[PDB]
Amino acid sequence: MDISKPVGSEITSVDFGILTAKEIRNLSAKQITNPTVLDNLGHPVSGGL
Amino acid sequence: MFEVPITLTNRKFAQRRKLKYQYINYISRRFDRISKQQKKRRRERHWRSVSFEIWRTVSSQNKQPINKQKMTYHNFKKIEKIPLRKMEIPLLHCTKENKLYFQSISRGLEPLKTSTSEVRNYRTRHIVTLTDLLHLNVSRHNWSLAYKIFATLIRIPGVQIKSLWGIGVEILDNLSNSSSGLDFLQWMCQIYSSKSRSIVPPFQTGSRTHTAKFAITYLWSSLINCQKSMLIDKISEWVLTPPFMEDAEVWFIYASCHLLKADINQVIKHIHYVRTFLKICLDKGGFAVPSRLIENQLKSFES
Amino acid sequence: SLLIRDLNDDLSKLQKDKVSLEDRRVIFSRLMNAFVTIQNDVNAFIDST
Numbered sequence A: 001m002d003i004s005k006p007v008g009s010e011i012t013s014v015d016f017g018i019l020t021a022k023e024i025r026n027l028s029a030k031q032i033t034n035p036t037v038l039d040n041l042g043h044p045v046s047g048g049l
Numbered sequence B: 001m002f003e004v005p006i007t008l009t010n011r012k013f014a015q016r017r018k019l020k021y022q023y024i025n026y027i028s029r030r031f032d033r034i035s036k037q038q039k040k041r042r043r044e045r046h047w048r049s050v051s052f053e054i055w056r057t058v059s060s061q062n063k064q065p066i067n068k069q070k071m072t073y074h075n076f077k078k079i080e081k082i083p084l085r086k087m088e089i090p091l092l093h094c095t096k097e098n099k100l101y102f103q104s105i106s107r108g109l110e111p112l113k114t115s116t117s118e119v120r121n122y123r124t125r126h127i128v129t130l131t132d133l134l135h136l137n138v139s140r141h142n143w144s145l146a147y148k149i150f151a152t153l154i155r156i157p158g159v160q161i162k163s164l165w166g167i168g169v170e171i172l173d174n175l176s177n178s179s180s181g182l183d184f185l186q187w188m189c190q191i192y193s194s195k196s197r198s199i200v201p202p203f204q205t206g207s208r209t210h211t212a213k214f215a216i217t218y219l220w221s222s223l224i225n226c227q228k229s230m231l232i233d234k235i236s237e238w239v240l241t242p243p244f245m246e247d248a249e250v251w252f253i254y255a256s257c258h259l260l261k262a263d264i265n266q267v268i269k270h271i272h273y274v275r276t277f278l279k280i281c282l283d284k285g286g287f288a289v290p291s292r293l294i295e296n297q298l299k300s301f302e303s
Numbered sequence C: 001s002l003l004i005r006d007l008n009d010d011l012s013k014l015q016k017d018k019v020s021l022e023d024r025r026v027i028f029s030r031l032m033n034a035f036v037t038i039q040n041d042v043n044a045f046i047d048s049t
């Protein structure tokens, strides 16, 4: 926290609710489908976690 | 009198290969006419296809009927007469013994003396005797001696490792000490699975398309190191690890790991699992039990 | 998930317009199995309880 980095926007309330499968699919960056996490060279498996 | 595990002593054998494949080119060229350099040898050798578990061959059907005589005396000597003089030109550049070899193979006579039998250099002849004694001792069940031969051999700076099956069956039958056949094999695969011609038939190979013998044999033989058990999720963990998709045999290895782990709803998931991999093993060139037998074991399980 | 996507693949390769009834019982057996264990894994996370 830095007195020379002021913030203009302010959160005033929070609403609780439920994520729909439509929202999720739209916002998602990648659909994950592979149980395997790494390969033999320690790189991320594509479509993995 | 046995194969030597060394690159063959050179010059004359290579220039003879020249004369041979060059004359071969001239004769077969004029032959296709009448039916109408390391690199010359290279194109020449190039344009040509390069109750028990029998990896069966390709038998006789769908092959084309016949031919009736192409080659009388007069017609052959027609094809032969000219390319032999073209050969008369560079024969004048090669050595007299080489020229004699060209004359005799071109008459059709086959040379008395092997490449080994005429070979000549101290170190290589000694390596020849070394490797020989290796192969002999391994044949003689003399795993101790043979092991000494192998270690002394691999020491030498000239030997890349064809010799690995020698050490696989060697340490295998040795049982004596040293980090064993499996360790060697998985070492072979770990060092020679990454970018990190004369000598090469299939039993030693490169990892673009199938490296065969050693890989499949450590695979099966490791599943038999589970026959020691009843390790599995290890073996199929590193059969899970590699992508070299044209296998299916590792699909049957996989489904066999699930049948062995299936020997409560967990066991159910293992049985549904093997049920899956048997069909994704119908993916490729089939390994088949009647497989209703596989399923019948799976119903003995469904009990 | 992958495993159910396979059950669903073999399930469609019925007609069974021909096709002898009982496999109906076994397909259901496999489906119940899948639903139960995914539902368990979700429960365990929200929930190991």
Ligand SMILES: [Mg+2]
Pocket (backbone or CB within 6 Å): B048, B049, B050
């Ligand atoms: Mg061929």
